[PDB]
Amino acid sequence: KETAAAKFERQHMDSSTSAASSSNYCNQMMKSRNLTKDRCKPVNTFVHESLADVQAVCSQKNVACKNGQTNCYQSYSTMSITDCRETGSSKYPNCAYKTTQANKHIIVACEGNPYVPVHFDASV
Ligand SMILES: Cc1cn([C@H]2C[C@H](O)[C@@H](CN3CCCCC3)O2)c(=O)[nH]c1=O
Known part of the structure; x- marks a missing residue:
């Protein structure tokens, strides 16, 4: 079964x-x-x-x-990220997304031992 840390890597790491x-x-x-x-x-x-x-x-x-x-953390440096946002014309199962590249500070929620990212909260 997929751990929270692994789900974070699947959803958010590239x-x-x-x-x-x-x-x-x-x-x-x-x-x-x-x-x-x-x-x-x-x-x-x-x-x-x-x-x-x-x-x-x-x-x-x-x-x-x-x-x-209280378990969120913001990166000291900007990071290369891509936001994916569903378009209005997107209809399941043909999911359609607007791709937006940017360099921003990420905010992640961390949990566990080891203490690792388990959720992507925001970018600022
Ligand atoms: C704001 C933001 C949210 N997310 C993801 C994390 C969660 O899976 C989900 C949380 N949230 C749920 C309610 C409002 C829309 C998004 O979206 C994400 O991946 N990048 C973002 O910049």
């Missing part, structure tokens, strides 16, 4: 491209990472940095999570 994220990127990635099976997941972010660099965020700037929990 170290393979630095930031080319073609116009096709989100359409392909949302599908391949199995985020279009139950429904079209409406919003998702992929981070183009090393797993070590993202895991390190759990020891960086402690900030409140959107849900009010």
Whole structure:
């Protein structure tokens, strides 16, 4: 079974491209990472940095999570990310996404021993 840490890697980690994220990127990635099976997941972010660099965020700037929990952390440096957002014309099972590349600070929720990212909260 998939651990919370593994689910985070599946949903949010893409170290393979630095930031080319073609116009096709989100359409392909949302599908391949199995985020279009139950429904079209409406919003998702992929981070183009090393797993070590993202895991390190759990020891960086402690900030409140959107849900009010205290276990969120903001990266000290900007990171290469791609936001995927479902279009209006997207109809399941043909999930369609707008691909947006940017360089922003990420905010992740961390849990466990080892203390690792388990949720992507925001980018700022
Ligand atoms: C704001 C933001 C959210 N997400 C993901 C994390 C959760 O799976 C989901 C949380 N949230 C649920 C309610 C509002 C829309 C999104 O979206 C994401 O992947 N990147 C983001 O920048």
